[PDB]
Design a protein around this ligand. Structure first.
Ligand SMILES: [Ca+2]
Ligand SMILES: [Mg+2]
Length: 300
């Protein structure tokens, strides 16, 4: 029997900052309490120290910040936390679902310096929920403005190198694609091309996000089948989420605005209820993005 549960997916590039703001706006702003929360960060800590010895007080800081921000109408249990340098993913479920979560595994893949360090890359948590297999990936891909090939390479390398082991020590490992349900979120860093920074801002003024999409690097590459084969993205009905002046909604361009921050998915029995950014949070040069899904899970 398929029963629907509500999944919240969120991605936020916090530009090396500690949380200054209440996250309720992002994580529980006029939504029903999700059954499951998948919350992704990039650039959690930008220090060389963090890049070097992993430890950083930004982890407890954003964890406290997310937990305080979850929907107040339910109690949530943290299932798993995973981080590679500045890339962190948190998985929470309502306390009443905890017993039905199993085979939780978490892995990381660095795809930055030398094609292997964690300045860029991916982290993932997969698990079983009742009798449905789910994998959630948070990734931070190459930032070069022109050279999207580097993002495609990061994406190809997360897919080929991310391997989850299994209790049975005689079985092959699982890859990201070996799941009934895949959610992929992150600062994917694809930008807008050809169009002038003037036109790109003006298009954003009059809210004509359809025309702009035709020049979005991610749209183009997905159609070219160089990444995200089989994935869907909901219509982008919110303005690009990068790059803003910290503490405001004005632009900064050291580089047109861009839909850096995205959530895609593939699987049967997945319906997307919403796809938003959250302008009111001004702690970072990105805005956070969120999506709620009704996902059908097989319950036996
Ligand atoms: Ca790379
Ligand atoms: Mg930054």
């Amino acid at each position: 029997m398929i029963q629907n549960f509500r999944f919240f997916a969120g991605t936020y590039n916090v530009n090396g900052q500690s949380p200054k703001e209440c996250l309720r706006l992002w994580l529980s702003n006029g939504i029903q309490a999700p059954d499951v929360y998948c919350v992704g960060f990039q650039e959690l800590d930008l220090s060389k120290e963090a890049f070097f010895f992993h430890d950083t007080p930004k982890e407890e800081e954003w964890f406290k910040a997310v937990s305080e921000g979850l929907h107040p109408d339910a109690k949530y249990a943290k299932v798993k936390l995973i981080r590679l340098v500045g890339i962190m993913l948190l998985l929470y479920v309502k306390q009443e679902h905890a017993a039905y979560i199993s085979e939780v595994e978490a892995e990381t893949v660095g795809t930055g310096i030398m094609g292997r360090m964690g300045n860029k890359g991916g982290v993932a948590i997969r698990f079983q929920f009742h009798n449905t297999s789910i994998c959630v990936v948070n990734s931070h891909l190459a930032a070069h403005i022109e050279e999207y090939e580097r993002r495609n390479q990061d994406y190809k390398d997360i897919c080929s190198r991310m391997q989850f082991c299994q209790p049975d020590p005689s079985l092959p490992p699982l890859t990201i694609s070996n799941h009934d349900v895949i959610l992929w979120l992150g600062d994917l860093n694809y930008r807008i091309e050809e169009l002038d920074v003037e036109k790109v801002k003006k298009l954003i003024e009059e809210k004509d996000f359809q025309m702009l999409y035709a020049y979005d690097q991610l749209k183009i590459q997905v159609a070219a089948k160089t990444v995200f084969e089989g994935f869907t993205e909901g219509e982008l009905t919110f303005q690009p989420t990068y790059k803003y002046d910290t503490g405001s909604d004005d632009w900064d361009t050291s580089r047109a605005p861009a839909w850096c921050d995205r959530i895609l998915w593939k699987g049967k029995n997945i319906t997307q209820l919403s796809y938003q950014s959250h302008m009111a949070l001004k702690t970072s040069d990105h805005k956070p993005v969120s999506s709620v899904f009704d996902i059908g899970v097989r319950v036996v």
